[PDB]
């Protein structure tokens, strides 16, 4: 009966928790893909069910390539290497609130945060500490459930992100992302 009813292409089910669940999957793909650059520990067994979903796959693709391209600039690269890894939560909290004070829903404040987060994850991974890797992920989702979820739901899920992915004049977008990251870092590294 319900299916026999008139439905415009699809339906409108609860995407509130759905979006949250998608975030947990997205973070996995992005981390797993980049973690492969470390090698492994001899996969005698391993669990490979093969990613069935193409949504997260496509999203991780663009994120991976962009994040990888954002490492070409040795200028910003060395700037990250000049960070103070004393207070992991405080550093993350600062940059989280920093790009929130203005309340600018430019979307870039999210993708920029992803690059910063992945850099920290990679750094911790190089220290051989899986524990912290799980902690950073929890913090990333923490802020997401805190306020981000409210903005993602409003835009109809990750539709906004899929529409934010442009191409023309992408160079300016690159400078935009770099500038945002630089700004927060400038307020962080205040002489020490």
């Amino acid at each position: 009966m319900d299916g026999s009813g008139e439905q415009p292409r699809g339906g409108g089910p609860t995407s509130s928790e759905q979006i949250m669940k998608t975030g947990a999957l997205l973070l996995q793909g992005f981390i797993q893909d980049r973690a492969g650059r470390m090698g492994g520990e001899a996969p005698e067994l391993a669990l490979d069910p093969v990613p069935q979903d193409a949504s997260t796959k496509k999203l991780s693709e663009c994120l991976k390539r962009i994040g990888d391209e954002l490492d070409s600039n040795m200028e910003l690269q060395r700037m990250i290497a000049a960070v103070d890894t004393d207070s992991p939560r405080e550093v993350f909290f600062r940059v989280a609130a920093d790009m929130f004070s203005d309340g600018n829903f430019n979307w870039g404040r999210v993708v920029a945060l992803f690059y910063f987060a992945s850099k920290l994850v990679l750094k911790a991974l190089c220290t051989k500490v899986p524990e912290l890797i799980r902690t950073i992920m929890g913090w990333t989702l923490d802020f997401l459930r805190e306020r981000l979820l409210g903005w993602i739901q409003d835009q109809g899920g990750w539709d906004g992100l899929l529409s934010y992915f442009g191409t023309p004049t992408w160079q300016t977008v690159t400078i935009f992302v770099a500038g945002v990251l630089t700004a927060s870092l400038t307020i962080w590294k205040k002489m020490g």
Partner: peptide, 20 residues
């Protein structure tokens, strides 16, 4: 938050071990 991050941390692992 603190409690929220814990549940989310679990969710992150929930989906992690779902594909790896």
């Amino acid at each position: 938050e603190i409690w929220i991050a814990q549940e989310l941390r679990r969710i992150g692992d929930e989906f992690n071990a779902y594909y790896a």
